[PDB]
Amino acid sequence: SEVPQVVSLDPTSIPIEYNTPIHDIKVQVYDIKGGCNVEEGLTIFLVNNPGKENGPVKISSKVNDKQVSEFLKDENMEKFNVKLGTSKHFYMFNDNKNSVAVGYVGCGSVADLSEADMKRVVLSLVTMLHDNKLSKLTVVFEINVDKNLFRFFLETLFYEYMTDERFKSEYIKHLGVYINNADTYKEEVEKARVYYFGTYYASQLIAAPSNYCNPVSLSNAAVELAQKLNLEYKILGVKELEELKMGAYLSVGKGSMYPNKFIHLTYKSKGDVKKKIALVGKGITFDSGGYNLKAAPGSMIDLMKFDMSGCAAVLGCAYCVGTLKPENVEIHFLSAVCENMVSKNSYRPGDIITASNGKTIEVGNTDAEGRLTLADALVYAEKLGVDYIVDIATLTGAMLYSLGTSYAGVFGNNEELINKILQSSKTSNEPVWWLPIINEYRATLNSKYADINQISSSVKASSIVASLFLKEFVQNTAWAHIDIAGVSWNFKARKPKGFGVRLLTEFVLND
């Protein structure tokens, strides 16, 4: 498990932060009926105006401080508006002559916030936290959210508040929440904190550049994670991968100085097993394209450290599952990890390679490497004899032109499973849309020489074609495929989303 180096200055591990300052925040949830106390730090009102305009801010909650309550009177507050994400905050002295900050974030005019909207709310709030030295934040909900959305608020807050400074060379210690029917929201708090970290852990792996995060260091990190969670683990090396005849997966890695590593973590519930699941993540630690090099305008080769986002989501999910400890489920966490590089040793456009199920594949484009690695992972996953196989992958850039940057696409061979994923999208608030596997396009994968083509020459619906290819490697097991090529990276914030950790955990939990 020694990471090879070219020079002594090359890093030999991924730095990982486990103990984050988010974990130090004491959280308290209070009912809003008893009035709000404003004694310290920053207090923010989440305010809308239905009908409205953008109408005026009007505060409805009772505040147990004379000076603040004066500040918050309708005549002052109408000077401001509830346009989504708009905020104002002011420092003042309270009834005990102590310095208090008080303000609001506008939640617009609709009464049901979408995940997108709520995200805009949190971002405004985070901007104030990053701009202010505070011991404590207090948030009071003057809008209605359900339990899942409340938890989404917390996760998004923690995640966005946290700043990754691992490669560079003050946080609040308390969070108060005022909300109607407080007691029903309390269970969401620590769940949010677990969901935050699984997501942030995924992010750290994705953000970690390819010199740091390579097939050896990523599998080392996965082992260290399993050890900390008491998960069973197994890392398959080149020799075993050859014995298993994983020729599609091995071919992708031929050109890399980093030997292929296959990750297999296993969680088992205490109880009687009622569902066995294999979660398979695409783990290309750097996708240069291979001989089909990413040289075309817009191919974004500098982003391609993110091509192990699927693997990160699966690993982050492992954190959440290993921590929350759901019952009656056995989960396998799989990733065929490798690096797609240019070398005398690389596989070539046109090569015919042989998958572990015996299928010969003609490589039409070395930059369609993910589906080759996934083919062998899927064969491996099916041999585990599980009930559901779900794979998640940054597989096709075409997703940007279908669903874009907000919704991932799910494709599958089984409507019941697909529907379970859509439900988990609803409760996780990571949005997914069901796209079809159109069988009429299957003929385009008929190779003249091999059993099957890797790519289509004629069909531009590449996300569907890739799904048709993948489907050839699952024979008799319910399977779904989540393409996160569009959603994984947050282009505007210049960072990963850690997309899919919460989706997969909800999937596991809801079962």
Ligand X SMILES: N[C@@H](c1ccc(-n2cccn2)cc1)P(=O)(O)O
Query: Between residues 307 and 391, which has the closer beta carbon with respect to ligand X?
Result: 307
By the 8 A CB rule, do 73 and 64 touch?
Answer: no
How many residues sit in the footprint of a copy of itself (CB under 8 A)? 115
The answer to whether 294 is a known ligand-binding residue is: yes
Selected binder of a copy of itself within 69, 86, 138, 219 (CB under 8 A)? 86
Strand stretches in 124-231, DSSP E: 136-141, 174-178
- Active-site choice (371, 420, 497, 502): 371
CA atoms within 13 A on the CB side of 458: 8
> Considering only 115-123, 187-195, 362-370, 503-511, which stretch makes contact with Zn ion by CB under 5 A?
362-370
Of 56, 61, 31, 27, the closest CA to residue 44 belongs to 61
Q: Which helix (H) or strand (E) holds 243?
A: helix 238-243
**Chain-centre distance of CA 315, in angstroms?**
10
Relative to beta strand 42-47, strand 99-106 is parallel
Q: Which of positions 283-312 make contact with ligand X (CB under 6 A)?
A: 287, 300, 307
Residue 146: how many other CB atoms lie within 10 Å: 13
367 lines the binding site for ligand X (CB under 6 A): yes
Cβ atoms of 316 and 196 within 8 Å: the answer is no
Q: Which of 168, 272, 385, 476 binds a copy of itself (CB under 8 A)?
A: 168
Whether 294 is catalytic is yes
Catalytic residue among 294, 359, 442, 495: 294
Question: Do 106 and 52 meet the contact criterion of CB atoms below 8 Å apart?
Answer: no
Q: Annotation-wise, does 95 bind a ligand?
A: no
| Rounded least distance, CB 233 to a copy of itself, Å | 24
| 415 binds a copy of itself, rule: CB under 8 A | no
Measured at the alpha carbon of residue 52, what is the angle toward residues 50 and 58, in degrees to the nearest 5? 80
Judged by CB under 8 A, does residue 360 bind a copy of itself? Answer: yes
What one-character DSSP code corresponds to residue 375? H
Q: Does 287 bind Zn ion (CB under 5 A)?
A: yes
Among the listed ranges 81-89, 348-356, 366-374, 380-388, the one in contact with Zn ion (CB under 5 A) is 366-374
CB 483 within 8 A of CB 393: yes
369 lines the binding site for ligand X (CB under 6 A): yes
The stretch near ligand X (CB under 6 A) out of 33-41, 156-164, 264-272, 391-399 is 391-399
Any idea how long the chain is?
A: 511
The secondary structure of 212-227, three-state, reads CCCHHHHHHHHHHHHH
Give yes or no for residue 310 binding Zn ion (CB under 5 A).
no
400 part of the interface to ligand X, by CB under 6 A: yes
483 belongs to the binding site for Zn ion (CB under 5 A): no
501: tokens are 């950790």
Nearest approach, Cβ of 344 to a copy of itself (angstroms)?
A: 4
Kindly state the DSSP code that residue 180 receives in the 8-state scheme. T
As a whole number of angstroms, the distance between CA 90 and CA 93 comes to 10
**Interacting span for a copy of itself (CB under 8 A) from 142-150, 255-263, 382-390, 501-509:** 255-263
Least distance between ligand X and beta carbon 369 (Å): 6
- Could you tell which of a copy of itself, Zn ion, ligand X, none binds residue 485, using a CB distance below 5 to 8 A set by kind? ligand X
Starting at the edge strand found earlier in the chain, the sheet holding 99-106 runs 26-30, 174-178, 136-141, 42-47, 99-106, 87-93
Q: Which residues are part of the catalytic machinery?
A: 294, 371
Residues at the binding site are 282, 287, 294, 302, 304, 307, 367, 369
Interface residues with Zn ion (CB under 5 A) are 284, 287, 307, 367, 369-370
Residues at the binding site for a peptide are 282, 287, 294, 307, 367
Interface residues with ligand X (CB under 6 A) are 287, 300, 307, 367-370, 394, 396-397, 400, 485
